[PDB]
Design a protein around this ligand. Structure first.
Ligand SMILES: *[C@@H]1O[C@H](CO)[C@@H](O[C@@H]2O[C@H](CO)[C@@H](O[C@@H]3O[C@H](CO)[C@@H](O)[C@H](O[C@H]4O[C@H](CO)[C@@H](O)[C@H](O)[C@@H]4O)[C@@H]3O)[C@H](O)[C@H]2NC(C)=O)[C@H](O)[C@H]1NC(C)=O
Ligand SMILES: *[C@@H]1O[C@H](CO)[C@@H](O[C@@H]2O[C@H](CO)[C@@H](O[C@@H]3O[C@H](CO)[C@@H](O)[C@H](O)[C@@H]3O)[C@H](O)[C@H]2NC(C)=O)[C@H](O)[C@H]1NC(C)=O
Ligand code: NA
Ligand code: NA
Lengths: 362, 99, 362, 116
């Protein structure tokens, strides 16, 4: 009935959204860290290839390793640019919009939870409208609802209740008076009229919206109405804008999965940086024919397919470094070493060795 | 990520992508039309040289095809990470096309 | 008087906090981008020094440049690791806690704003308690108070209303009945009693807290009480925990200002990576005395003070590259080139040149 | 800002043991080498950023040991055969350091008093 407390069919879908929004900051941390980790993996491979080249000057494979190093260094560079220019804003915006909307929802649900007169009469009722609900651990009446922002550890968020289309559980309501409102439970938050609702000496001067514009509480003796949020379109200035903003921000996320962060499997000539480097440093011409590039790649890689790139990478990974550059009895193969700062100083050592060779050769 | 063609002057506006990291090319149907390098310092044109001009505006995440003396076909934009502006490149992203 | 609507002294400090929390995501984006930009500047300096060492192979100047390159590459490496491990978590946590708290505040303030019966009686009153206030633009009665999360663009972090000690404007209130509550304006949100407040047939079962535990609304005919939040300490499980969470997360921020992101001015031997590289690659010993390091640094830098490092960096910055490697009429001196991907491919060109010259000389 | 916070000091009888801790906040602990100094200023001991190298002053070698717990952002000094050891003990951090008393330290704690 109009002007009565809210049964679980009304507020449980809000709890479901609030719980899922709680995971959005966890996904932001996950993606920002994944982007950095992938950049670091690209940098490690660039450094391994660079070290192989310094050690093996004099062979054609050393020049192949210069090409490999350039590829991975360009990937690391472009990944950092993507992290700066694109992912940081995506993940901050998703974190902020989701957390803000969650704050709006949680403040409203916490108000309903506390606005009760007895164990059978209040603003927040169970499914049947028998008992008022109470906070119990991380639930309200058994429904997961923490009404808190949880500590942030990296995790991929679910998209069950907020997905590409909108808020799946926030559908059009055909009979709020019977499906959302109880028959008996008293709740002044259910209307703006003065007899049973928020007005004191008379009705409120206008309808009141709550939960960032989701629920509209009329100033007369009639049931609430709700926004259908399950089929959203991009908009501005809406009365329920925070719902749109969180939906748009979550749907926009790519994760650390654009081309900068992923290795390539389409042959050597088409790999990032390769053709341009062959043209600029080996052919020394401004524009090349595909067959001219293949001829150069044959000299250094013995081919132009993924298998020849993998073979050079195996030579790089198998190459041992000087034992004094690592601990006693520690691994020496480049492929058994990782960490940007660690590999950086190993490259410096071999550059110093190269300097000593040229000092005599010249 | 999305490349969205629009528009004679065609526009291709990206979303979810670091526009400045990418070379961009126009194709039509499949034939190559023109390409611009990631830095914007190089352009290459197909049948269309002297009639079409390709340009980029990094601040607007938009790549453009200015067509003069006209096609008929669907025109598609494509992105190539750090590419030199070549029709032979591997393109990581493509639009849906515009008529 | 108890149970009456709230004058501006009550809600204006909440608007001030809300508007400042709105800037936390902007500052997170600013800091994440600043960290990446500083890493990129370190990498550019590493790449310029690396290119100089390839061009000038076999010289003491080149060996100095290898030491410079190693220094800046280690800084770039460590900065990316700090961005991954420390800054990302700091900024996601500050963004989430601030935005969540802002949502809790804004839902409460928006409720007060709408709960009115006339231009003179309502929950949200002006400074004197004469008129209810209205929202126009992003202001409420002239107070900046958008009650929305603004679009996110980078903005340098600042702190005025939420600082190291807490929320400066949220002080102990010794006379809420006269300073917060009006004399006349009616507002059922000001008490839990049934006559003038939220109760219907009787008083609410307990006190109700609002705005994430900031204000306590009694179930009797008595004035609200508020938490003093201007001198916070770390706590867990508090009724006003979200306020503590946002304060702690903001206080924790270091920005892109730790040692990884800042250049050093403490002489050469103590510069990150330098003594270890001299020991490992030049002396080829595990331990060294300071005099042995100074002797090596004299050979390559002509000294061990900042001025000698700066002098090598000036030589590096003045070194031109081949005109074919840049655009027409574009600068060719290394110090006039910037951008990681741009310098990376120049380094690849000169590594190719070095490989070929090594072949010819041997 | 970054904080290094020493704890565990106090009044201890000579010949016994005491554990000092240094816990960091706001810093990527795994990026830094850490050292103990003391002032009754002199070097006590150091651990490399990797944890693979430690160095102790002659006056404490064979009596004190040092370790790091990256997972807890904590750096330790285990003091044994306490004697001359009374001083304020300070922890200090050195970016990517090798564990050397000669390094430049970017961060310093406030100290903890040990009285033997
Ligand atoms: C993009 O691809 C490159 C190339 O694969 C990749 O770099 C490689 O990274 C791995 C570390 O993830 C390096 O080490 C290998 O790791 C795998 C998986 O743990 C191991 O199985 C390998 O061991 C084999 O090889 C060793 C050396 O040959 C042997 O000792 C061992 O017994 C095994 O036979 C190896 O440890 C690998 O060295 C690099 N490759 C290069 C060329 O640097 C890069 O990480 C990828 N990028 C991203 C973002 O994922
Ligand atoms: C840490 O310090 C180094 C050394 O100063 C910084 O690298 C340097 O960056 C500047 C640009 O910010 C380069 O300056 C150039 O100087 C000429 C004037 O002679 C001018 O024409 C250019 O426009 C530019 O200003 C300089 O070449 C470069 N030095 C080296 C050796 O690469 C580095 O950016 C600093 N790191 C951070 C994070 O600030
Ligand atoms: Na490509
Ligand atoms: Na240092």
């Amino acid at each position: 009935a109009a002007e009565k407390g809210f049964k679980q069919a009304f507020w449980q879908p809000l709890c479901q959204v609030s719980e899922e929004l709680d995971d959005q900051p966890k996904g932001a941390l996950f993606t920002l860290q994944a982007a950095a980790s992938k950049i670091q993996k690209m940098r490690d491979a660039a450094l391994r290839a660079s070290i192989y080249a310094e050690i093996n000057h004099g062979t054609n494979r050393a020049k192949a390793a210069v090409i490999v190093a350039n590829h991975y260094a360009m990937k690391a560079d472009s990944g950092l640019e993507a992290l700066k220019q694109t992912l940081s804003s995506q993940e901050v915006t998703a974190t902020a919009t989701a957390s803000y909307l969650k704050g709006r929802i949680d403040e409203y649900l916490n108000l309903l939870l506390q606005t009760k007169e007895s164990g059978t009469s209040g603003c927040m009722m169970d499914t049947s409208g028998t008992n008022t609900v109470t906070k119990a651990g991380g639930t309200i009446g058994g429904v997961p609802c923490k009404l808190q922002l949880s500590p942030i550890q990296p995790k991929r968020p679910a998209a069950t209740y907020l997905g590409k289309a909108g808020y799946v559980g926030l559908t059009r309501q055909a009979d709020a008076a019977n499906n959302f409102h109880d028959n008996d439970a008293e709740c002044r938050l259910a209307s703006g009229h003065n007899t049973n609702g928020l007005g004191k000496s008379g009705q409120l001067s206008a309808a009141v919206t709550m939960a960032a514009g989701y629920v509209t509480v009329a100033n007369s003796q009639t049931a609430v109405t709700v926004q259908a949020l399950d089929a959203l379109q991009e908009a501005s200035g809406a009365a329920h804008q925070p719902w749109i903003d969180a939906w748009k921000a979550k749907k926009a996320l790519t994760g650390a999965e654009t081309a900068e962060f992923r290795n390539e499997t389409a042959g050597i000539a088409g790999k990032t940086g390769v053709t341009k480097l062959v043209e600029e440093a080996l052919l020394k011409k401004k524009d090349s024919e595909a067959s001219e590039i293949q001829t150069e790649l044959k000299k250094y890689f013995s081919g132009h397919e993924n298998e020849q790139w993998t073979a050079i990478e195996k030579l790089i990974s198998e190459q041992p470094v000087a034992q004094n550059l690592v601990g006693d009895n520690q691994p020496t193969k480049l492929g058994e070493l990782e960490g940007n700062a660690k590999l950086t100083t190993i490259l410096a050592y071999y550059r110093m060795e190269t300097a000593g060779k040229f000092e005599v050769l010249t | 990520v999305q490349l969205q063609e629009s528009g004679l002057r065609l526009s291709c506006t990206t979303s979810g992508l670091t526009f400045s990291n990418y070379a961009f090319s126009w194709f039509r149907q499949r034939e190559f039309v023109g390409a611009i390098s990631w830095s914007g310092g190089r352009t290459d044109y197909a049948s269309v040289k002297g009639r079409f001009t390709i340009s980029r505006d990094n601040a607007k995440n938009t790549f453009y095809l200015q067509m003069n003396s006209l096609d008929t076909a669907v025109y598609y934009c494509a992105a190539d990470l750090l590419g030199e502006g070549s029709r032979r490149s591997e393109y990581e992203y493509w639009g849906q096309g515009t008529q």
